[PDB]
Amino acid sequence: GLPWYRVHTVLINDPGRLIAAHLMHTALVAGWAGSMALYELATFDPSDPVL
Amino acid sequence: QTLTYDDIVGTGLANKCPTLDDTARGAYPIDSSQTYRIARLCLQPTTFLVKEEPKNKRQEAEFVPTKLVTRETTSLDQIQGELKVNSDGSLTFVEEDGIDFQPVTVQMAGGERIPLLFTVKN
Numbered sequence A: 001g002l003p004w005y006r007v008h009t010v011l012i013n014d015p016g017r018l019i020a021a022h023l024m025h026t027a028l029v030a031g032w033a034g035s036m037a038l039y040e041l042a043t044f045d046p047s048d049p050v051l
Numbered sequence B: 001q002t003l004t005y006d007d008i009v010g011t012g013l014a015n016k017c018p019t020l021d022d023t024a025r026g027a028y029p030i031d032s033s034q035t036y037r038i039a040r041l042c043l044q045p046t047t048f049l050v051k052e053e054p055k056n057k058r059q060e061a062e063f064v065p066t067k068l069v070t071r072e073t074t075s076l077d078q079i080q081g082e083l084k085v086n087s088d089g090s091l092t093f094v095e096e097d098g099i100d101f102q103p104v105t106v107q108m109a110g111g112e113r114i115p116l117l118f119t120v121k122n
């Protein structure tokens, strides 16, 4: 069977599932941006941009 | 003109004071031998400003604008009191009675809510 370190080689000759994995990576990265921003907004103090 | 309750209800105009023409720039004489009264005084706020808390360094705090969140519930009206003529000639109004307070909540940037008793009591 495939070793663990080779699981994603199944996409090498499957252009659609390659596009599906690339879409999921993109979805997760945009997801992260959104969540990081909301956590930052929930913790940012804007009352003093000097000190 | 002589509008009616049913003309006005629900429009937001019950919270507005009456107004005088662009052309009412005359003058009302005070017969010092005479006695007077405000038969109706109406105050209608149009902006609320709150002083901001300047940091320990400070430099100066300014009055910042705020969002009204309690609707057309803010005006003071039907206020009465006597207009005396003093001896140096000045006029002094002394409130007796009237709807002379409104609670009001406005909201500062960032989301802090600030209640206040908008009043001219006494």
Ligand code: CLA
Pocket (backbone or CB within 6 Å): A002, A006, A007, A008, A010, A011, A021, A022, A024, A025, A028
């Ligand atoms: C961008 C991320 C990504 C994508 C698109 C894929 C895509 C794919 N994987 Mg891969 N994989 C990934 C990450 C990814 N994987 C990671 C990080 C691991 C290590 C766990 C694996 C392990 C893995 C195995 C072991 C196998 C695949 C397989 C596959 C294929 C079929 C789907 C499947 O069986 O999913 C399985 C994968 C998952 C269900 C990923 C689970 C990871 C979760 C979502 C992490 C969540 C952590 C948790 C919620 C913590 C939250 C925060 C905490 C504070 C609580 C497909 C090509 C299969 C395949 O075709 O083999 C040929 C297969 O057998 N992958």
Ligand code: CLA
Pocket (backbone or CB within 6 Å): A004, A005, A006, A007, A008, A009
């Ligand atoms: C765009 C980046 C990219 C892409 C698309 C790939 C894609 C691939 N790599 Mg390469 N590779 C890359 C970067 C990349 N690699 C880099 C930077 C390194 C150096 C670290 C390697 C080192 C490397 C080795 C040494 C091998 C591959 C192999 C492979 C293939 C199988 C991998 C697999 O199933 O993983 C499966 C992995 C898991 C199931 C779990 C891994 C969990 C890791 C250790 C921690 C996860 C971190 C976390 C998810 C956050 C993401 C990281 C961060 C950068 C965002 C696949 C074609 C394999 C191959 O050639 O097979 C033919 C192989 O042997 N790659």
Ligand code: CLA
Pocket (backbone or CB within 6 Å): A015, A018, A019, A022, A023, A026
């Ligand atoms: C018609 C020309 C054209 C255009 C405009 C694109 C555009 C793109 N391709 Mg390329 N591609 C083309 C023809 C084209 N392709 C051909 C002829 C092939 C061979 C069959 C490929 C094969 C190919 C592969 C295999 C991959 C791409 C990928 C990508 C995307 C990478 C960046 C990304 O996802 O941004 C981030 C995305 C966004 C900001 C969202 C944009 C959404 C747009 C507006 C599309 C909306 C829906 C639309 C109908 C989908 C089809 C669009 C088009 C890609 C056909 C990007 C949208 C990658 C991809 O899909 O990434 C996931 C990828 O893995 N392309």
Ligand code: CLA
Pocket (backbone or CB within 6 Å): A008, A025, A028, A029, A032
């Ligand atoms: C330029 C930016 C960039 C690039 C090139 C990549 C590239 C990659 N990412 Mg994505 N990622 C990015 C930004 C990027 N990422 C961002 C900004 C986020 C949001 C935080 C993510 C979140 C993300 C997730 C959630 C996942 C990926 C995955 C992947 C890999 C998919 C292909 C594969 O099988 O690799 C094969 C794997 C390797 C070649 C391993 C490379 C190891 C890298 C360098 C990390 C090094 C070890 C890591 C630091 C240890 C973490 C320990 C920690 C748990 C304490 C590929 C290496 C997937 C993945 O790793 O699947 C297994 C996956 O699950 N990425």
Ligand SMILES: CCCCCCCCCCCCCCCC(=O)OC[C@H](COP(=O)(O)OC[C@@H](O)CO)OC(=O)CCCCCCCCCCCCCCC
Pocket (backbone or CB within 6 Å): A002, A003, A004, A005
């Ligand atoms: C989104 C977040 C999710 C994160 C996913 C989690 C990470 C996924 C799993 C990674 C764990 C990898 C472990 C695989 C490890 C494991 O499977 O090893 C054995 C494995 C043997 O592979 P073969 O080619 O024989 O294939 C057999 C197959 O059954 C493997 O699938 O070797 C490899 O994986 C090569 C890497 C060796 C790695 C060497 C590690 C040995 C260190 C031991 C000594 C420790 C220190 C002690 C001395 C002080």
Ligand SMILES: CC1=C(/C=C/C(C)=C/C=C/C(C)=C/C=C/C=C(C)/C=C/C=C(C)/C=C/C2=C(C)CCCC2(C)C)C(C)(C)CCC1
Pocket (backbone or CB within 6 Å): A028, A029, A030, A031, A032, A033, A035
């Ligand atoms: C579905 C849907 C929706 C929704 C969406 C959502 C809700 C999403 C979410 C998303 C999200 C929410 C996402 C996020 C993401 C995240 C991520 C993906 C992360 C990552 C992480 C990592 C990767 C890390 C790593 C690390 C660690 C952990 C430690 C330290 C070091 C490092 C950095 C390495 C809508 C309605 C719109 C539409 C329809 C459909």
Ligand SMILES: CC1=C(/C=C/C(C)=C/C=C/C(C)=C/C=C/C=C(C)/C=C/C=C(C)/C=C/C2=C(C)CCCC2(C)C)C(C)(C)CCC1
Pocket (backbone or CB within 6 Å): A032, A035, A036, A037, A039
């Ligand atoms: C069609 C349809 C449907 C659909 C659905 C769906 C599509 C869903 C989705 C879902 C999803 C898609 C999910 C998501 C989730 C995710 C998660 C669960 C994540 C989490 C994350 C996290 C954990 C993060 C964290 C962080 C970061 C990253 C940074 C900053 C900070 C923090 C820490 C926050 C239904 C069923 C409704 C039914 C009807 C029909």
